[PDB]
Ligand binder design. Sequence first.
Ligand SMILES: N#CCc1ccc(Nc2nccc(Nc3cc(C4CC4)[nH]n3)n2)cc1
Length: 313
Amino acid sequence: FPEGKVLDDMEGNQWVLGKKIGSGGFGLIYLAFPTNKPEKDARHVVKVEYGPLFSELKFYQRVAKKDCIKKWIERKQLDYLGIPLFYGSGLTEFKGRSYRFMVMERLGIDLQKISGQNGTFKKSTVLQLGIRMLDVLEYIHENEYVHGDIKAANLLLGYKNPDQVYLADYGLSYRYCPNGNHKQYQENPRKGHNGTIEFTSLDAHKGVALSRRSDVEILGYCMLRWLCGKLPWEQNLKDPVAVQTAKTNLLDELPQSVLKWAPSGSSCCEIAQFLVCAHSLAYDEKPNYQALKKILNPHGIPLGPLDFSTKGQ
Ligand SMILES: N#CCc1ccc(Nc2nccc(Nc3cc(C4CC4)[nH]n3)n2)cc1
């Protein structure tokens, strides 16, 4: 697609493209500017596909409303909420094929790229990331949505503020509570073992519709990975059933399963308690976000900027 190309979103706003700034599977990402405001400052990007983008579109149109997010932050006294802002979307012709685009908030580098020693960050960073995502999860959950794929590759540092962290890629996000109607529990083997096998919930392994607890479980597994440097099931990633039984054994054998895994110069008291609290949730139970943030921060410490320093690694 040529730089200079003017896109027209459903709202009738007009978006001039910049240089490709990467791509995933199903996604090309370009810089973008509105055609009316200045060009000193690329605040905006354009994601393009042509399935999973539509999931994001649904997520972002319903959940990522600026002022509503503004009302929320103010009440709960958060410095910020790790949700990318959404500006509009629409279609555009490239050959004779049509493509779907979404104009998103511009953001910095993803955490996996900037992992510390192996895939490891400093404990107090691991614990703040978990608290930050607890802020995000409360918000999306409250708005009928689960992420279903929390992991380092989908945690981005701010563009404006790098000490700010943001949860992205709502391509596996699921509306668990449409207008207050919680989904029923039904195991479906045919819908079994979607997600990132390393971090996906047991509900996900068993082909259950993702609910609030699955996100909490996922965050649990993630923290464990960012601290201890790997997971008991690092071996069995290609046998998802092996991964499921591993996860099952870890949760049925808490807290020790988790306390034992930590290297000596670090602790898993918080991560262990956190998973213990996550395991005691029924399929349709509201997580106690405030209590889990205490578990992650038992000394009621204030949150510094994120330390990713890799001095010595
Ligand atoms: N790093 C990296 C690759 C990467 C690609 C796509 C996504 N998904 C995504 N979802 C929602 C908003 C959003 N905004 C962006 C994207 C960028 C440029 C592309 C880096 N800044 N801000 N990006 C996230 C990371």
